[PDB]
């Protein structure tokens, strides 16, 4: 991250070994479960591009996925270079990605007036690449999810919303899915109870009713 | 590392026992997997030469590899002495390596105006020696990697890019490898699908297609 030094100037704070080891543990154990993106985003709060790159280089495994992430940063940084032509100097996509930008340039922009938040901009590109990885590591679309004939409705809801979280679909599609597929793919008894609640029932009401099956 | 003291002067910060124990764990468990170089580089952020030397001395095992690293620092520091003849004083290769330089000389140069970053310079030589170790600890060249007859394409990609990371070849060779060998060494069905995509397909497209086999 960045901090004020005791000399009264903005200076880099290096990543703690506990933060790097946490990120290793996260990526090793959770293997791009969707929770890895908020976990990454928490571990990389205030990160400069060099800090982000040090996290990504440390992963070691999953190199096919890390290449899909590099393909994403390629096209996102090219899109930045397209949307922001060249005239501190303004950062190019390779500056935001931390390749052509020194650490001191990164801190310079992140503390400019107004700031250019190259750490956050690059972190958006990484998070978007992790999103593509997370879909392709999901085994099932939400359309595949159906309640087991004796599966508790709370466990089916947990499967459904955990899948819906990985989906992709635009937000109004996720509204239609949580209204419609959640009912449509229940077991016949719970399905009948849900339809008896009417279409506007909240998840709390739906669970409270179908717990009785 | 280096910090501002409460007296208002630049002063050494000693390595934490958690950083040294982390480096021991890393080198003991990961045995110069290519990830050890970014992991080393993160653990040694802002390190003086004395700090780097304390990390390397602490390794204990792998002494044949640590000798290959000393052979590398020998030739790199000799090349520095060749490229930078003698006229604070300017550092010799033995000063940057932290042998003939006190800690106070190291901090002096690392806080000079302009600075001479003897910590970073020496860390480049160490990282280059670790690169030579990492190749020789790799069992296979990328040319040896072929997809198993029923191996999932995502697992073959992971083997391929993990090997390509250790390679060595210059960057345009790695471009040619990821375009050509990645297709050429797939299983016959996935290989046929990949050729049906055309030569410019991205890794995301390639995986998305060959997942169907």
């Amino acid at each position: 991250p960045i901090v004020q030094n005791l000399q009264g100037q903005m200076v880099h704070q290096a990543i703690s070994p506990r933060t790097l080891n946490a990120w290793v543990k996260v990526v090793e154990e959770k293997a791009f479960s969707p929770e890895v993106i908020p976990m990454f985003s928490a571990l990389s709060e205030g990160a400069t591009p060099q800090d982000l790159n040090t996290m990504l280089n440390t992963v070691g495994g999953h190199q096919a996925a890390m290449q899909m992430l590099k393909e994403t940063i390629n096209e996102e940084a090219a899109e930045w270079d397209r949307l922001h032509p060249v005239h501190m100097r303004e950062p190019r996509g390779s500056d935001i990605a931390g390749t052509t930008s020194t650490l001191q340039e990164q801190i310079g922009w992140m503390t400019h007036n107004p700031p250019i938040p190259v750490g956050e901009i690059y972190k958006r590109w990484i998070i978007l690449g992790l999103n593509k990885i997370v879909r392709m590591y999901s085994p099932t679309s939400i359309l595949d999810i159906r309640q087991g004939p004796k599966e508790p409705f709370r466990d089916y809801v947990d499967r459904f919303y955990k899948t819906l979280r990985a989906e992709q679909a635009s937000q109004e599609v996720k509204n239609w899915m949580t209204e419609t597929l959640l009912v449509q793919n229940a077991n016949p008894d719970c399905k009948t109870i849900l339809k008896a609640l009417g279409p506007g029932a909240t998840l709390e009401e739906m669970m409270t009713a179908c717990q009785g099956v | 590392p280096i910090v501002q003291n409460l007296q208002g002067q630049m002063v050494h910060q000693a390595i934490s026992p958690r950083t040294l124990n982390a480096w021991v764990k890393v080198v003991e468990e990961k045995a110069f997997s290519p990830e050890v170089i970014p992991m080393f580089s993160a653990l040694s952020e802002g390190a003086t030469p004395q700090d780097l030397n304390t990390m390397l001395n602490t390794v204990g095992g792998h002494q044949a590899a640590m000798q290959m690293l000393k052979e590398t620092i020998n030739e790199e520091a000799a090349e520095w002495d060749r490229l930078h003849p003698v006229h604070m004083r300017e550092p010799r290769g033995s000063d940057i390596a932290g042998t003939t330089s006190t800690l106070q000389e190291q901090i002096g140069w690392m806080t000079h105006n302009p600075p001479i970053p003897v910590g970073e310079i020496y860390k480049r030589w160490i990282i280059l020696g670790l690169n030579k170790i990492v190749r020789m600890y790799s069992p296979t060249s990328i040319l040896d990697i072929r997809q198993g007859p029923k191996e999932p394409f995502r697992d073959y990609v992971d083997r391929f890019y993990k090997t390509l990371r250790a390679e060595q070849a210059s960057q345009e060779v790695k471009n040619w490898m990821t375009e050509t060998l990645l297709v050429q060494n797939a299983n016959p069905d996935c290989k046929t699908i990949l050729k049906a995509l055309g030569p410019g397909a991205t890794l995301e497209e390639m995986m998305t297609a060959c997942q169907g086999v």
Binding site: P49, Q50, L52, N53, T54, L56, N57, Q67, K70, I73, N74, A77, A78, G93, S94, A97, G98, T99, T100 | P38, Y161, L164, R165, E167, A169, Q171, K174, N175, M177, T178
Partner: peptide
């Protein structure tokens, strides 16, 4: 491109 296939992240070009 900004990051090439075999390279680490944050690798300076050339």
């Amino acid at each position: 491109p900004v990051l090439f296939p075999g390279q680490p992240f944050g690798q300076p070009p050339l």
